[PDB]
Design a protein around this ligand. Structure first.
Ligand SMILES: [Cl-]
Ligand SMILES: [Cl-]
Ligand SMILES: [Cl-]
Length: 163
């Protein structure tokens, strides 16, 4: 574990992370996809061998010895708010189990279901709070990756408020 487990946020492409493993914002079919998923496919294509997994779950595939944890958040265009909320919380609980099993000291993570699976809604607080609920009991350093300048400021404020 990290000596003083922390949360940090960086505004940049998660394919350039400086952590021991990465979480992909995956689709259930293991396809290259869009956004974070397409960047992950270009950087670690070998990790898409048998990466298909259901909504609300995470499946890890190694690229060399580097773990890629494919986490499938719900597409809010298809789920109701209540069911989508439950599956989004579940995907993050599975990421915490995988990070613990892998024994890593750090993990790079995006906010699940905040891009094309958001159903056109701002889900920063919803997704980040489910991330904290799952990851708080782990001892890995967590680095959250985002692309928007206003989202970086809001995620940073949420992290600092709890310290
Ligand atoms: Cl970048
Ligand atoms: Cl998304
Ligand atoms: Cl973003």
């Amino acid at each position: 574990g990290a000596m003083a487990p922390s949360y940090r946020v960086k505004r940049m492409d998660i394919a350039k992370n400086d952590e021991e493993c990465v979480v992909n914002a995956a689709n259930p079919r293991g396809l290259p996809g869009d956004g974070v998923c397409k960047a992950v496919y270009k950087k670690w294509p070998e990790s898409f061998k048998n990466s298909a997994t259901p909504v609300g779950t995470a499946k890890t595939v190694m690229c060399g010895t580097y773990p890629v944890i494919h986490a499938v958040g719900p597409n809010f265009s298809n789920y109701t708010e209540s069911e989508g909320d439950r599956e989004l919380a579940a995907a993050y609980r599975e990421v915490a189990k995988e990070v613990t099993r892998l024994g890593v000291n750090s993990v790079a993570i995006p906010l699940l279901s905040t891009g094309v699976y958001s159903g056109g809604k701002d889900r920063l607080t919803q997704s980040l709070n489910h991330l904290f609920t799952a990851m708080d009991s782990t001892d890995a350093d967590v680095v959250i990756y985002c692309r928007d300048k206003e989202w970086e400021k809001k995620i940073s404020e949420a992290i600092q408020m709890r310290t």
